[PDB]
Amino acid sequence: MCLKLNLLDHVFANPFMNAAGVLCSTEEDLRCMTASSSGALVSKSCTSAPRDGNPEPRYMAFPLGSINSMGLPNLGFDFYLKYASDLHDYSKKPLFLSISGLSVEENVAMVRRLAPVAQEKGVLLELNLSCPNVPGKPQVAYDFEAMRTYLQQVSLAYGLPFGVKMPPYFDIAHFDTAAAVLNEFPLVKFVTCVNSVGNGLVIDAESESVVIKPKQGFGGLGGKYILPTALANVNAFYRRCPDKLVFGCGGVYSGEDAFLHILAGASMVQVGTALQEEGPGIFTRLEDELLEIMARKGYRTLEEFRGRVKTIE
Amino acid sequence: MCLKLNLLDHVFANPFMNAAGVLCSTEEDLRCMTASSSGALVSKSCTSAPRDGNPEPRYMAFPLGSINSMGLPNLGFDFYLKYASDLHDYSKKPLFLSISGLSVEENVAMVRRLAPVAQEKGVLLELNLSCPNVPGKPQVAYDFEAMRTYLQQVSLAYGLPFGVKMPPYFDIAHFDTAAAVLNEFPLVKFVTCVNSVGNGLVIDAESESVVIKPKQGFGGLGGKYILPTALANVNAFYRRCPDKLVFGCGGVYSGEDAFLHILAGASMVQVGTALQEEGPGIFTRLEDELLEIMARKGYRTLEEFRGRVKTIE
Ligand SMILES: Cc1cc2nc3c(=O)[nH]c(=O)nc-3n(C[C@H](O)[C@H](O)[C@H](O)COP(=O)(O)O)c2cc1C
Ligand SMILES: Cc1cc2nc3c(=O)[nH]c(=O)nc-3n(C[C@H](O)[C@H](O)[C@H](O)COP(=O)(O)O)c2cc1C
Ligand SMILES: O=C(O)c1[nH]c(=O)[nH]c(=O)c1CCc1cccc(Cl)c1
Ligand SMILES: O=C(O)c1[nH]c(=O)[nH]c(=O)c1CCc1cccc(Cl)c1
């Protein structure tokens, strides 16, 4: 019994990977994720130029999850591209590269350069549709016309199958509109649901203070807080995008959590907060625990139950 | 050292009250809330006509919170207006009446008839804007033009101070726009943040099934899941609406949780899920717990620390 699967013309030993931004910023990080038992890895969302990010403290974790306002610190696109083209050992597992330019033109410039490497080496693109706040306009994935422009421009520039990292939605009309946008683009072959739940606020009762420095303490939430939100977004897009894969992210700490994401529709399962907190050991645990639940249920494959969450009649 | 507040021309023994929908649908429920140690109570959001609501199961609770798609079951406006006009004992505590018409005209019809009772008896209106409008459009408060129309029409029809119940927002642009809309309406004297986090999905691993019947298992989340989201919305509206009160709702299980809401800016503090699960005894516990945190810190009144959350550097 093994968890190997095939997606996007690649073979995966198991459905687990890191979530973008966690354990994936530096060469050291990417080597550590490669050496882990994860089925794949994704690089830190990048910009054309390197970024320092926001002042520290910018990430904190707690028993129920995490809050962050990192500010997109990254080593820049040239580094990640080099890692993809020269350094990654593809014999060990697939690599996804996350891009998050601050305008459409920046995304286009990056993807034009990634394309040949994607062709030659098989690196996969995850386009992050979330960015630092600009006063006066919403995040791109929350502005449907902007989203359509980004996907039109990236599709043209890139020309090859890619995926999109989505923020959570909370309204059924929004799910319908967003999915319809995504389904206009045949090159969008996977959708990753979800990014952090935006602009939460954690306060420490003893100090009477917020816990992160940027944005007056406001930052995205991950971990246990967000599992039902994540499951709902996975399932909503799984139902609406039958010609795409859905990758689940949010609130995975256990094989059971992964099992729920898969039941909701997830093909790959990404781990953020829990990986940040436990380290890359977590992947062997998650695999063991998912296999144990499959065995207790009599499931031999992921396909037997992916998307098969039951509704009440 | 005391929990007393004086706001909206009423006196409150303490800041605690039920959240709309919990322990407030029937005369029995309102009598129970009145007999409790809470500082106030709110009646179940109503429509002009009585509603049975959605099929059961439609609420479920778990260690980290709750999910619901109740479908607005209620006894109809005339019953809650009779309770306000004829049955409530205002010498025990203040009463809020929540309305949640399914169109602007239904809201207008109710408020026109509420107004004389509000003027004579002092019942306070909470208008629910985290509510459906046209199916396939977002809920009212996620549609800023609709929201503006509702507030214009209700301000004209009612002509007295009222408050609004808001869904959570997740994007700074939304906080900015929503607050700006609210600030167009001088009669909006309080803003209650937040309603449930919309369209989550809880799945039970053993049965491989969603846990509520309506909407294929999708429903609004309350409880421990949503505290940091609640705190963020309280503080965001507190900062942006300096001429209004903010009432906090979401994730209150303890005096400490309430202290965080108040630090964020809350005047009143509403209790949903935890009240549903524990019952009205919770209010003595929350009062004792909040008084003990105040004693330890040397605070004598709520105003000493309301809105006084600290930011970093
Ligand atoms: C420290 C930190 C940095 C992150 N950076 C990014 C990023 O660069 N790109 C991205 O798509 N998401 C990023 N995220 C979001 C995560 O990929 C993931 O969507 C989110 O944390 C929810 O998953 P979780 O509940 O497992 O943490 C970041 C998350 C954290 C905690
Ligand atoms: C069973 C149930 C019914 C509710 N009905 C309403 C309602 O009629 N009107 C409304 O404004 N909010 C309603 N809500 C939302 C709550 O008032 C509250 O905003 C939400 O549950 C978050 O608070 P909590 O974390 O304390 O549960 C309901 C919540 C629950 C759990
Ligand atoms: O680097 C980040 O702060 C980050 N954190 C996340 O949880 N998700 C992300 O996608 C990112 C990068 C993009 C981004 C999104 C929103 C705010 C900021 Cl400061 C940065
Ligand atoms: O009665 C409800 O489902 C409900 N539940 C909540 O958590 N908050 C609410 O504001 C309400 C009432 C509004 C509402 C929400 C969803 C469907 C319908 Cl028909 C009406």
Please confirm, yes or no, whether B32 is among the known catalytic residues: no
Q: Does A15 touch chain B (CB under 8 A)?
A: no
**CATH code, domain carrying A214:** 2.30.26.10
- Which residues in chain A have Cβ-Cβ distances shorter than 8 Å to B197? 170, 229
Beta carbons of B260 and A205 less than 8 Å apart: yes
DSSP string, B13-72: SSSEEEPTTSS-SSHHHHHHHHHSS-S-EEEEEE-SS-B--SPSP-EEEETTEEEE----
| Whether B244 contacts B186, CB under 8 Å | no
CA B281 to chain centroid: 19
A276: enclosing H helix or E strand = helix A273-278
Chain B hits for A212, Cβ within 8 Å: 312
Please judge whether B229 and A200 are an interchain contact, meaning their C-beta atoms are less than 8 angstroms apart: yes
Question: Does one domain contain both B66 and B8?
Answer: no
Q: Which of A96, A97, A110 is nearest to A39 (CA)?
A: A96
Q: Distance between CA A262 and CA A249 in Å, rounded?
A: 11
Cβ(A167) – ligand 3 distance below 6 Å: no
C-alpha B279/C-alpha A171 separation (Å) is 30
How many angstroms separate the CA atoms of B279 and A108, rounded?
56
Task: Give the closest residue to B164 by CA, choosing from B110, B118, B222, B100.
Answer: B100
B204 and B99 in a single domain? The answer is no
Q: Which residue's structure tokens are 């726009």?
A: B177
Q: What resolution in angstrom units was achieved for this structure?
A: 1.5
A195 token code pair: 């990014």
Residue B9 CB coordination number (10 Å):
10
Please tell me the experimental approach by which this structure was elucidated.
X-ray
What DSSP assignment string belongs to A117-182?
HHHHH--EEEEE-----BTTB--GGGSHHHHHHHHHHHHHHH-S-EEEEE----SHHHHHHHHHHH
| Residue A271 DSSP symbol | E
3-state secondary structure of A266: strand
Does the beta carbon of A68 sit less than 6 angstroms from any atom of ligand 1?
yes
Tell me the CB-side half-sphere exposure of residue A104, using CA atoms within 13 A.
15
* Amino acid type, B170: F
What is the DSSP track for chain B?
----EEETTEEESSSEEEPTTSS-SSHHHHHHHHHSS-S-EEEEEE-SS-B--SPSP-EEEETTEEEE-----B--HHHHHHIIIII--TTT--EEEEE--SSHHHHHHHHHHHHHHHHHH--EEEEE-SS--SBTB--GGGSHHHHHHHHHHHHHHH-S-EEEEE----SHHHHHHHHHHHTT-TTEEEEEE--PEEEEE-EETTTTEES-SGGGGEEEEESGGGHHHHHHHHHHHHHH-TTSEEEEESS--SHHHHHHHHHHTEEEEEESHHHHHH-TTHHHHHHHHHHHHHHHHT--SGGGTTT-PBPP-
Yes or no, beta carbons of B232 and A199 under 8 Å apart: yes
Q: Is B100 in the pocket of ligand 4 (CB under 6 A)?
A: yes
Q: Identify which of A17, A18, A22, A44 to mutate to test ligand 1's pocket (most ligand atoms within 8 A of the CB).
A: A22
Q: Which long-range contacts (CB under 8 A, 24 or more apart) does B280-283 make?
A: B280/B23, B280/B32, B280/B33, B280/B35, B280/B36, B280/B37, B280/B38, B283/B14, B283/B16, B283/B36, B283/B37, B283/B38
Residue A233 has, within 13 A of its CA and on its CB side, a CA count of: 27
Rounded Cα–Cα distance for residues B75 and B97 (Å): 13
- Please identify which residue in the block is written with the tokens 């209004």: B244
Among residues A188, A222, A256, the one where a domain terminates is A222
Give the closest of B168, B225, B260 to A228, CB-based. B225
Q: Is A220 helix (H, G, I), strand (E, B) or coil?
A: strand
CA of A226 to the centre of ligand 4 (A): 20
Question: Ligand 1 pocket, A229 CB below 6 A?
Answer: no
Indicate if B149 and B191 belong to the same structural domain.
Answer: yes
Minimal-distance CA residue to ligand 3 atom 13:
A131
Q: d(Cα B118, Cα B23) in Å, to the nearest integer?
A: 22
Cβ(B101) to ligand 2 under 6 A?
no
Alpha-carbon distance B258 to B228, whole Å?
A: 12
Q: Is B20 annotated as a binding residue?
A: yes
Closest-lying ligand 2 atom to the alpha carbon of residue B18: 17
The interaxial angle of helices A104-121 and A144-158, nearest 10 deg, is: 40
Probe residue for ligand 3, chosen from A131, A142, A150, A199 as the CB with the greatest number of ligand atoms within 8 Å: A131
Q: Residue A104 phi/psi, 5° resolution? A: -60, -45
**B residues 131-150 near A, CB within 8 Å?**
136-139, 142
Query: Are B2 and B85 in a shared domain?
Result: yes
Both B3 and B62 in one domain: the answer is: no
Put simply, the chain B residues between 94 and 133 with a CB less than 8 A from any chain A CB are none
Between CA A300 and CA A237 the distance in angstroms is 25
Residues in A touching B264 (Cβ below 8 Å): 201, 203
Alpha-carbon gap: A202 to the closest alpha carbon of chain B (Å): 5
Given B205, B222, B239, the domain boundary residue is B222
Q: B200 and A174 in contact by Cβ < 8 A?
A: no
Distance CA(A177)–CA(A169), nearest Å, equals: 11
> Do A292 and A188 fall into the same domain?
yes
Q: Could you give the CA distance from residue B75 to residue B73 in angstroms, rounded to a whole number?
A: 7
Q: Are B66 and B60 within 8 A, CB to CB?
A: yes
Structural domain including B290 reads: 1-53+72-196+223-313
- Local structure of A96: helix, strand or coil: strand
In this structure, the answer to whether residues A76 and A218 fall within a common structural domain is no
* B268 contact partners, CB below 8 Å, separation of at least 6: B5, B7, B12, B15, B16, B17, B39, B40, B190, B192, B245, B247, B248
The residue whose two tokens read 């971990």 is A223
CB B212 within 8 A of CB B60: yes
Do B286 and B258 form a contact (C-beta atoms < 8 A)? Answer: yes
The span from the CA of A282 to the CA of B19, in Å, is 39
- Report CB contact under 8 Å: B137, A226: no
B213 in the same domain as B140: no
Q: Which of B125, B126, B161, B167 is nearest to B144 (CA)?
A: B167
Residues B39 and B177 in one domain: yes
A280 CA to centre of ligand 3 in angstroms: 22
Are B170 and A172 a contacting pair at CB < 8 A? no
Residues 6+ apart with CB under 8 A from A259: A290, A293, A294, A305, B205
B229·A221 Cβ contact <8 A: yes
> Which chain A residues have a beta carbon less than 8 Å from that of B228?
67, 200-202, 221, 225
- Furthest-apart CA atoms within chain B: distance in Å: 55
CA distance A102 to chain B (A): 16
Task: Flag whether B69 is marked binding.
Answer: yes
Whether the CB-CB separation of B158 and B123 falls below 8 Å is answered with no
Distance CA A100, CA B207 (A): 39
**Omega of the bond leading into B111 within 30 degrees of 0 (cis):** no
Give the closest residue to B104 by CA, choosing from B69, B135, B140, B73. Answer: B140
Burial letters for A54-77: b for 16+ Cβ neighbours within 10 Å, e otherwise? beeebbbbbebbbbbbbebbbbeb
The candidate with the shortest Cα–Cα distance to B248, out of B274, B139, B259, B180, is: B259
Distance CA A125, CA A119 (A): 11
- Ligand 1 proximity of A272 Cβ (cutoff 6 Å): yes
Q: B interface mutation test: which of A174, A203, A256, A306 has the most B CBs within 10 A?
A: A203
Ligand 4 atom 19 nearest Cα = B71
A62, A64, A171, A204, best to mutate vs chain B, most B CBs in 10 Å? A171
- Residue B168: asked if its preceding bond is cis (omega within 30°), the reply is no
Residue B193: closest CA among B155, B145, B156, B244? B244
Together in a domain, B18 and B44: yes
CA distance B23 to B295: 30
Q: Give the rounded distance of the alpha carbon of A50 from its chain centre.
A: 21
Instruction: For residue A275, give the H/E element and its range.
Output: helix A273-278
Same domain, A177 and A84: yes
> 3-class SS at A312?
coil
Q: Output the CA angle A204-A208-A210, nearest 5 degrees.
A: 60
CATH number at residue A105: 3.20.20.70
Residue where a domain terminates, one of B173, B205, B222: B222
From chain A, the residues in CB contact with B256 under 8 A are 205
Q: Do A133 and B171 touch (CB under 8 A)?
A: yes
Closest CA to B3 of B31, B38, B30: B38
Angle at B156 between CA B151 and CA B159, to 5 degrees: 105
Which candidate, A177, A36, A114, places its Cα nearest to that of B137?
A: A177
Least CB–CB distance from A259: residue in B167, B205, B293: B205
What count of other Cβ atoms lies within 10 Å of the Cβ of residue B37? 17
Token pair of B124 as six digits: 């306070």
Same domain assignment for residues B132 and B5: yes
| Omega of the bond leading into B214 within 30 degrees of 0 (cis) | no
Which helix or strand (DSSP H or E) is residue A248 part of?
strand A245-249
Q: How many domains does chain A have?
A: 2
Query: In angstroms, how far is CA B255 from the centroid of its own chain?
Result: 18
Nearest CA to A247 out of A262, A232, A236 is that of A262
